[PDB]
Amino acid sequence: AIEFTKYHGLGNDFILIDNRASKTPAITPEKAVEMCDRHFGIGADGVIFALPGENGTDYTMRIFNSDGSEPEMCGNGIRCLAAFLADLEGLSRNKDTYRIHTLAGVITPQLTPDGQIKVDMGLPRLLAGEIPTNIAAADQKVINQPLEVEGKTWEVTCVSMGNPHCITFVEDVAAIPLETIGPKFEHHPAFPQRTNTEFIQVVSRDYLKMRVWERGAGITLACGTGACASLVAAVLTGRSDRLATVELPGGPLEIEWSEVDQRIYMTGPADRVFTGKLH
Amino acid sequence: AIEFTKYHGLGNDFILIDNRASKTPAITPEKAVEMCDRHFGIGADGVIFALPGENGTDYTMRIFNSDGSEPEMCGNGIRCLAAFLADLEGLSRNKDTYRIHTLAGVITPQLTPDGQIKVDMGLPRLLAGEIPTNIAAADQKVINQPLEVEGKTWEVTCVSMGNPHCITFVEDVAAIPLETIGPKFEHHPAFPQRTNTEFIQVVSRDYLKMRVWERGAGITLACGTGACASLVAAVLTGRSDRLATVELPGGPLEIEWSEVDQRIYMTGPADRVFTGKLH
Ligand SMILES: *C[C@](N)(CCC[C@H](N)C(=O)O)C(=O)O
């Protein structure tokens, strides 16, 4: 009886639910796990609810990861949600931007003329207490710091986009055994709320290649918050400029850490795949 | 513009298409690959077409694997198709069994009172030429024969249920590195048309545990033709009786190699997950 629409942003794929009738998400986290199961359910990286606006915003977004946990933001999902909201509003839509309340703060996607969606992702949070991580003291940044993972010491940089990211720079990202090492970062004791983990190969100062092991979702084909965080980490470590393409397994995102307002802007696509109803 | 229903049989999941309007499948193999993609499409192990009957049968089944190739039969998919046909017929249904034309021959599912589907899967095909495989001469069976895969010699038995199977018996099926070794069996030169590969742990003479790397689909949670072939192989090698439970990752199937008619009967569930429409 549940109607939904399947979207993906660069192959990070989501079940979108019109939840305008209530501030309460209409499916539980447990049911979201069942719906995200790729064989027994619909199959997705997460469920996204289009919820009533709060505190002057146009709408609210909540998301459950495919493990049922509730993260604070999602960039690919915000793009999908903006596309979904435009589809719901149809010819009643009177603007090209939505102000969206999230657990991380207000996030503003803009539907651009060429079909892409450009998102004001807010300010990156750089202090260890904001990640959160215990690698450094709460009031310190975490830049090129050591993390021992199964006896091997990695150099990592942590950044939060509302959610935690642990970024490490590598010579050959395709060679990372991501299915094995990803969970060991995700659940490392240094991360009290777990972390997302990005492996970055710098191709040039404006082009990063990324693979990710996501908190609560595993190997995904793209991660918007993670691409933002990785660009921030590349700037902080002197490896990249503030405007770059981040090439993900599912395709490219354009990331800009603006010198005007110090906010991150992320531009990419959103694709509606199919509409469905649960039996 | 394509409407479809998602089903699974023990987690082996399929897109079912009502194709009774024409003998021409509504989608090409290339489009089936796109639709079976888990992140960019609907996500499935295969597309199954409910087609008009041929040569006296009630309906015809064709199936595309998620890689686009067209196999000759599918047991989990026949069960799902029988459930789909019963829904499509609705109150006009006047029988509990359908005779279904397939590339492998006529296959007859029976909707049983308890919600399961029992399928007459036909005679197993035991000669190397019928598999096909080059392990033995075309007129010989293939029972506990050697197969070198990356320099390690496995003992294998081959059986066809219309499609090829290569069965090997192991002490601990959970321990098989299936992602790594599966494709090496699938594409081994001994199999000119590739093969499905089943790893079997005998628990008792009426209980087998199975994991499978499918031709054209990879790691699946269940395979009906493969469970049938594995029971046949277990009988041929003296390891099991002719009636057994085959426990797959997705659940159990009941397999019987009847002594009355030497045909294989397979019983298991079918579950309708959701209906949908491509954007
Ligand atoms: C949607 C996402 N890939 C972030 C999803 C949340 C993370 N899995 C987490 O738990 O923080 C994105 O595109 O940003």
Ligand SMILES: *C[C@](N)(CCC[C@H](N)C(=O)O)C(=O)O
């Ligand atoms: C549906 C299936 N798992 C068989 C599907 C065909 C094989 N992948 C092949 O290529 O032979 C079943 O349940 O029998």
